[PDB]
Amino acid sequence: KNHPMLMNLLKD
Amino acid sequence: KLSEEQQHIIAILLDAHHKTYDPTYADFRDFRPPVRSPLSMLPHLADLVSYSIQKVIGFAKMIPGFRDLTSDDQIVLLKSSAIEVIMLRSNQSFTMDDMSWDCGSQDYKYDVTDVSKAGHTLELIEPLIKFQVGLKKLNLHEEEHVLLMAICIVSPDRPGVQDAKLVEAIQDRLSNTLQTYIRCRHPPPGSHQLYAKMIQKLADLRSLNEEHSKQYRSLSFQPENSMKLTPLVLEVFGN
Ligand SMILES: CCC(O)(CC)COc1c(C)cc([Si](C)(C)c2cc(C)c(OC[C@@H](O)CCC(=O)O)c(C)c2)cc1C
Structure with a gap:
């Protein structure tokens, strides 16, 4: 799996 | 007693919480209605939980040291802890009147039956209420509350963590800050008793996490249920 949404939220 | 660095940490965590917990609950009107x-x-409660996940991520990013972790370790800590921090942070709206979560209006007030109408059984809800009652009876200052949330997130014993020693070093600083704060407010043995009960709460959260995970897996396996979830919930709680 990957977590583009969580990652995107981590990069805010 | 409390060093300048310990005061710094507490100030930062209090501010992080003020920036990510909205006690007006104004955004609830944007959710699908109850x-x-x-x-x-x-x-409704999938939207609320998914919103809360976003706030937990915002809080976590401001924990001193969390930035020093790799993106992989940041993701695994958040994935593992999100449900626990949600259970912890929801205690601020919990009320001992009717054993319910009161978010400012009758529409946005949630009891055991509301949680069961999102799919969970008393296997989870009974210990969750017992947890909320016991946490409420600790009567924590906000300083202890935000430290506990941060300690909850930065735990080196989460599965998948790659730099456990770094995670542990971060958590130790937070744990030292909390132990010193308790000592400043309470002589022994009350200090030791209070810290011991806070540690027991973190253990309770792990059991609640496991039981939520079991029930979430069974529920989200039905596509008619997953269809009602949000993309963020499916990503964070899936896998
Ligand atoms: C969708 C997956 C599923 O598993 C259902 C299939 C979720 O299940 C649930 C779980 C795990 C917990 C809960 Si609850 C501990 C009663 C709770 C949670 C929150 C976020 C909350 O909001 C208060 C503040 O948190 C405001 C927001 C903020 O934190 O800023 C309140 C008042 C109560 C309810 C459900 C339905």
Whole structure:
């Protein structure tokens, strides 16, 4: 799996 | 007693919480509405939970040291802890009147039956209420509350963590800050008793996490239920 949404939220 | 660095940490965590917990609950009007479907509350409470996940991520990013972790370790810590921090942070709206979560209006007030109308059984809800009652009876200052949330997130014993020693070093600083704060407010043995009960709470959260995970897996396996979830919930709680 990957977590583009969580990652995107981590990069805010 | 409390060093300048310990005061710094507490100030930062208090501010992080003030920036990510909205006690007006104003955004609840943007969720799919509560309906009182057998799982008639799942649209509303899936939106609420998914919103809360976003706030937990915002809080976590401001924990001193969390930035020093790799992106992989940041993701695994958040994935593992999100449900626990949600259970912890929801205690601020919990009320001992009717054993419910009161978010400013009758529409946005949630009891055991509301949670069951999102799919969970008393296997989870009974210990969750017992948890909320016991946490409430600790009567924590906000300083202890935000430290506990941060300690909850930065735990080196989460599965998948790659730099456990770094995670442990971060958590140790937070744990030292909390132990010193308790000592400043309470002589022994009350200080030791209070810290011991806070540690027991973190253990309780792990059991609640496991039971939520079991029930979430069974529920989200039905596509008619997953269809009602949000993309963020599916990503964070899936896998
Ligand atoms: C969708 C997956 C599923 O598993 C259902 C299939 C979720 O299940 C649930 C779980 C795990 C916990 C809960 Si609850 C501990 C009663 C809770 C949670 C929150 C976020 C909350 O909001 C208060 C503040 O948190 C405001 C927001 C903020 O934190 O800023 C309140 C008042 C109560 C309810 C459900 C339905």
